Design an enzyme around this catalytic site. Structure first.
Site, PDB file in Angstrom:
ATOM      1  N   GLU A  55       0.841  -1.183   0.000  1.00  0.00           N
ATOM      2  CA  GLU A  55       0.000   0.000   0.000  1.00  0.00           C
ATOM      3  C   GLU A  55       0.885   1.244   0.000  1.00  0.00           C
ATOM      4  OE1 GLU A  55      -2.698  -0.421  -0.984  1.00  0.00           O
ATOM      5  OE2 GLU A  55      -3.105  -2.466  -0.365  1.00  0.00           O
TER       6      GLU A  55
ATOM      7  N   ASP B 265      -0.638  -3.954  -9.545  1.00  0.00           N
ATOM      8  CA  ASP B 265      -1.271  -5.235  -9.260  1.00  0.00           C
ATOM      9  C   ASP B 265      -1.241  -6.234 -10.412  1.00  0.00           C
ATOM     10  OD1 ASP B 265      -1.840  -3.935  -6.912  1.00  0.00           O
ATOM     11  OD2 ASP B 265      -3.958  -4.488  -6.867  1.00  0.00           O
TER      12      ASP B 265
HETATM   13  C1  LIG Z   1      -6.597  -0.308  -4.580  1.00  0.00           C
HETATM   14  C2  LIG Z   1      -5.466  -0.334  -5.593  1.00  0.00           C
HETATM   15  O1  LIG Z   1      -5.132   1.093  -5.945  1.00  0.00           O
HETATM   16  C3  LIG Z   1      -4.068   1.276  -6.920  1.00  0.00           C
HETATM   17  O2  LIG Z   1      -4.758   0.945  -8.051  1.00  0.00           O
HETATM   18  C4  LIG Z   1      -5.191   1.857  -9.068  1.00  0.00           C
HETATM   19  C5  LIG Z   1      -4.765   1.399 -10.502  1.00  0.00           C
HETATM   20  O3  LIG Z   1      -3.355   1.419 -10.651  1.00  0.00           O
HETATM   21  C6  LIG Z   1      -5.336   2.429 -11.509  1.00  0.00           C
HETATM   22  O4  LIG Z   1      -4.996   2.122 -12.853  1.00  0.00           O
HETATM   23  C7  LIG Z   1      -6.893   2.477 -11.394  1.00  0.00           C
HETATM   24  O5  LIG Z   1      -7.452   1.280 -11.831  1.00  0.00           O
HETATM   25  C8  LIG Z   1      -8.784   1.344 -12.399  1.00  0.00           C
HETATM   26  C9  LIG Z   1      -8.689   1.352 -13.936  1.00  0.00           C
HETATM   27  O6  LIG Z   1      -7.933   2.495 -14.398  1.00  0.00           O
HETATM   28  C10 LIG Z   1     -10.103   1.424 -14.519  1.00  0.00           C
HETATM   29  O7  LIG Z   1     -10.067   1.427 -15.957  1.00  0.00           O
HETATM   30  C11 LIG Z   1     -10.951   0.201 -14.036  1.00  0.00           C
HETATM   31  O8  LIG Z   1     -10.417  -0.989 -14.535  1.00  0.00           O
HETATM   32  O9  LIG Z   1     -10.987   0.141 -12.544  1.00  0.00           O
HETATM   33  C12 LIG Z   1      -9.631   0.078 -11.930  1.00  0.00           C
HETATM   34  C13 LIG Z   1      -9.796  -0.013 -10.404  1.00  0.00           C
HETATM   35  O10 LIG Z   1     -10.590   1.056  -9.878  1.00  0.00           O
HETATM   36  O11 LIG Z   1      -7.299   2.726 -10.041  1.00  0.00           O
HETATM   37  C14 LIG Z   1      -6.757   1.805  -9.034  1.00  0.00           C
HETATM   38  C15 LIG Z   1      -7.337   2.261  -7.674  1.00  0.00           C
HETATM   39  O12 LIG Z   1      -8.743   2.189  -7.656  1.00  0.00           O
HETATM   40  C16 LIG Z   1      -2.788   0.476  -6.528  1.00  0.00           C
HETATM   41  O13 LIG Z   1      -1.826   0.642  -7.561  1.00  0.00           O
HETATM   42  C17 LIG Z   1      -3.099  -1.003  -6.221  1.00  0.00           C
HETATM   43  O14 LIG Z   1      -1.876  -1.647  -5.851  1.00  0.00           O
HETATM   44  C18 LIG Z   1      -4.149  -1.068  -5.077  1.00  0.00           C
HETATM   45  N1  LIG Z   1      -4.429  -2.491  -4.731  1.00  0.00           N
HETATM   46  C19 LIG Z   1      -4.148  -2.901  -3.310  1.00  0.00           C
HETATM   47  C20 LIG Z   1      -5.499  -2.949  -2.544  1.00  0.00           C
HETATM   48  C21 LIG Z   1      -6.173  -4.107  -2.219  1.00  0.00           C
HETATM   49  C22 LIG Z   1      -7.492  -4.036  -1.453  1.00  0.00           C
HETATM   50  O15 LIG Z   1      -7.244  -4.469  -0.104  1.00  0.00           O
HETATM   51  C23 LIG Z   1      -5.598  -5.495  -2.593  1.00  0.00           C
HETATM   52  O16 LIG Z   1      -6.548  -6.490  -3.064  1.00  0.00           O
HETATM   53  C24 LIG Z   1      -4.462  -5.454  -3.676  1.00  0.00           C
HETATM   54  O17 LIG Z   1      -3.838  -6.722  -3.693  1.00  0.00           O
HETATM   55  C25 LIG Z   1      -3.410  -4.347  -3.295  1.00  0.00           C
HETATM   56  O18 LIG Z   1      -2.355  -4.296  -4.212  1.00  0.00           O
END
Ligand SMILES: C[C@H]1O[C@H](O[C@H]2[C@H](O)[C@@H](O)[C@@H](O[C@H]3[C@H](O)[C@@H](O)[C@@H](O)O[C@@H]3CO)O[C@@H]2CO)[C@H](O)[C@@H](O)[C@@H]1N[C@H]1C=C(CO)[C@@H](O)[C@H](O)[C@H]1O
Ligand SMILES: [Ca+2]
Length: 636
Positions: free
Chosen positions: A123, A214
């Site tokens: 995070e 991710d």
């Molecule tokens: C929560 C998540 O945030 C970060 O992610 C961001 C992505 O890098 C962005 O590109 C954007 O993604 C969106 C796409 O652009 C859109 O076209 C559509 O496909 O929806 C996507 C998702 O909304 O926005 C993302 C944030 O909303 C960050 O880089 C990533 O590592 C974060 N994930 C962590 C959070 C959780 C929840 O507990 C875990 O499951 C994951 O394993 C963690 O890595």
């Protein structure tokens, strides 16, 4: 002129407590197809991070996958990146726990045939002192976001190189993730990424752009399997990215073996940009959003985004009191259990970050992720000798009372209705009050009609033995939703207490405010039993007044899609197989039982939904002057 170095990395993680199908789906949808395609392009280089549990699931279910990773590592296509074995947010766990956490995953990386030198910051929550910790664990670089640097004062233009940073005289290298690449990859067409990278080239041969996000984004996230695999985005990207003479592909370690970091810089507490929104109290999060949107609406967000700021991750402990309690309880147990390896392993598992916060979906709102944290806090503590104690656990300035015997741990908050906020079973390893109250979120308010009628937000926190005062003609639906008229001031007000043998004596001088303040006094004698607890109540009014006194007991019922229900009962049972199990509530006198599921709003791309966080059971007894009864909770 000079080529632009490009670093490509992915981060694979599944939080402990996830359903088996989830691991299976992520493996089939992302983890496997991604590496199979990487195997097809010998020149492609990837920096990959796998969380400990994930690697353990793979060894047990998909051994062949590991032989593939060993092969790719051997052919120079993979640099293994580590972190805390169970995905803890490093800044939120004891420094001692950070060490063991990272080394456990370094041991695993080592078994894949790679001596990890880098850390994916879970995070990306940064604190200056993490430098010391990463350093003690043998880590030479950590992966953060461009936003961490912009927040320090640098412009985006000077973030195409890694930087050194120091603390305690120790220094480590920091790489910034280019936010743009996180949105170009893999959602936009390949050319969009090639064009962007090519435009970054300059006369500085050390310039570099970093993508790291991710792994699940390549196949699991809704729509991504079709786009990335069925429609060939990955195959097209790997071919393009390895066949471009202006783009030089390399791993983090390769970069450091050739180029020295640009210079020294200091970072504040930050995370990736999107987190600045979620970590703010609901009200402020809404404002933050309005601000961002209006900046984009006036085409000036791009030149001013470097000055936009929001919340910080640790404040989820403020936003969600239930997360703070969970967190402080594990900190408490981690310390007492530090010299016991077997016990300690359990507390390390309880530090898996996901259930402690909430972004756009899931997190602390998923009961299965929450119960898993509690499950582990309990198993670690079970190795300790039972001992009652008074202390401020969640640091709100008013001591908690922890009563415990051989089968239970109960945490009482005298200050808040003298209620039991934690009833942990050492046998089932479940906290019977592992529930959440209904709260408004900044992203609420589109929501369908079928759900709006079931929506309601609480003013009361939720615990066990919550004393109410309602009118005889009050309805279940009014109570269910938060419309009813609470005549008493005992639910959220302080209670005096007296410690006793195996329990506590609690009482409060308040009043039943209806047409006139009618002073009242509630007494409750709580004693732990070998299979639960028993509470002897004695409600007293100063002047006659027909009414209904109710004792509320919230329960972490998860596998029981319960519905509103009122019935006559002296004793009743609850059977929640996949959650709290079997329990019985016994009264020495019949009462009107009011039951209803605690529904929380959950947003998905499949529209709005509801998550049952638990169920509330309120035993109503009529009262006019004197009221005396006993409630007994029993674990079956
Ligand atoms: C929560 C998540 O945030 C970060 O992610 C961001 C992505 O890098 C962005 O590109 C954007 O993604 C969106 C796409 O652009 C859109 O076209 C559509 O496909 O929806 C996507 C998702 O909304 O926005 C993302 C944030 O909303 C960050 O880089 C990533 O590592 C974060 N994930 C962590 C959070 C959780 C929840 O507990 C875990 O499951 C994951 O394993 C963690 O890595
Ligand atoms: Ca407290």
């Amino acid at each position: 002129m000079e080529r632009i170095n490009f670093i490509f990395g992915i981060h694979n993680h599944q939080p402990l407590g996830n359903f088996g199908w989830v691991f299976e789906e992520a493996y089939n949808r992302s983890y496997r197809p991604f590496m199979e395609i990487l195997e097809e392009f010998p020149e492609m280089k990837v920096n990959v991070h796998f969380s400990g549990p994930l690697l353990e699931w793979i060894e047990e279910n998909k051994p062949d996958y590991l032989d593939l990773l060993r092969s790719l590592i051997k052919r120079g296509q993979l640099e293994i990146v580590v972190a805390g074995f169970y995905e803890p947010v490093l800044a939120a766990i004891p420094k001692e726990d950070r060490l063991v956490q990272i080394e456990m995953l370094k041991d695993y990386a080592r078994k894949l045939g790679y001596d990890a030198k880098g850390v994916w910051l879970t995070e990306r929550v940064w604190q200056p002192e993490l430098v010391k910790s990463l350093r003690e664990a043998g880590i030479e670089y950590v992966v953060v976001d461009d936003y961490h640097f912009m927040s320090a004062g640098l412009s985006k233009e000077e973030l195409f190189w890694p930087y050194y940073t120091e603390d305690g005289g120790e220094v480590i290298t920091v790489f910034p993730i280019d936010e743009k690449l996180r949105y170009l990859i893999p959602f936009r067409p390949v050319k969009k990424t090639i064009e962007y990278l090519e435009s970054l080239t300059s006369d500085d041969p050390s310039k570099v752009a970093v993508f790291h996000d991710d792994g699940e984004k390549f196949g699991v996230w809704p729509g991504t399997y079709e786009w990335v695999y069925e429609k060939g985005w990955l195959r097209e990207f790997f071919d393009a990215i390895t066949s471009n003479e202006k783009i030089n592909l390399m791993t983090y370690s390769e970069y450091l073996s050739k180029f020295t970091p640009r210079g020294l810089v200091y970072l504040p507490i930050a995370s990736y940009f999107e987190m600045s929104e979620w970590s703010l109290p609901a009200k402020q999060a809404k404002l933050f959003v309005e601000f961002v949107e209006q900046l984009k609406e006036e085409g000036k967000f791009e030149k001013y985004r470097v000055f936009v700021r929001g919340g910080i991750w640790k404040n989820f402990f403020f936003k969600y009191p239930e997360s703070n309690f969970m967190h402080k309880r594990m900190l408490m147990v981690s310390k007492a259990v530090r010299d016991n390896p077997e016990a300690r392993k359990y507390i390390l598992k309880a530090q898996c970050n996901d259930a402690y916060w909430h972004g756009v979906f899931g997190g602390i709102y998923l009961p299965h992720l929450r119960r898993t944290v509690w499950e582990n806090i309990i198993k670690a503590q079970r190795y300790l000798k039972p001992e009652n104690k008074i202390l401020d656990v969640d640091f709100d300035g008013r001591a908690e009372i922890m009563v415990e015997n051989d089968g239970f741990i109960a945490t009482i908050k005298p200050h808040y209705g003298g209620s039991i906020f934690e009833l942990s079973s050492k046998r089932k390893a479940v906290n019977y009050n592992d529930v959440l109250p209904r709260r408004w979120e900044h992203y609420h308010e589109q929501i369908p009609e079928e759900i709006r009628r079931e929506l309601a937000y609480d003013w009361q926190l939720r615990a066990i033995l919550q004393d109410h005062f309602i009118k005889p003609e009050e309805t279940l639906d009014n109570y269910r939703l938060v419309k009813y008229h609470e005549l008493g001031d005992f639910v959220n007000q302080p209670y005096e207490y007296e410690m006793i043998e195996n329990g506590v004596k609690l009482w409060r001088e308040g009043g039943v405010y209806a047409e006139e303040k009618i002073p009242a006094r509630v007494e409750k004698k709580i004693e732990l039993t070998e299979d639960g607890f028993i509470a002897k109540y004695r409600v007293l009014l100063e002047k006659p007044y027909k009414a209904l006194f109710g004792v509320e007991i919230n329960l972490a019922v998860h596998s029981v899609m319960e519905k509103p229900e009122e019935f006559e009962a002296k004793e009743f049972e609850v059977n929640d197989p996949y959650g709290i199990g079997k329990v019985r509530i016994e009264l020495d006198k019949a009462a009107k039982v009011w039951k209803f599921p605690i529904k929380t709003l959950s947003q998905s791309e499949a529209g709005w939904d509801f998550i049952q966080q638990g169920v509330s059971y309120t035993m109503l007894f009529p009262i006019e002057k004197e009221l005396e009864f006993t409630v007994r909770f029993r674990e079956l």
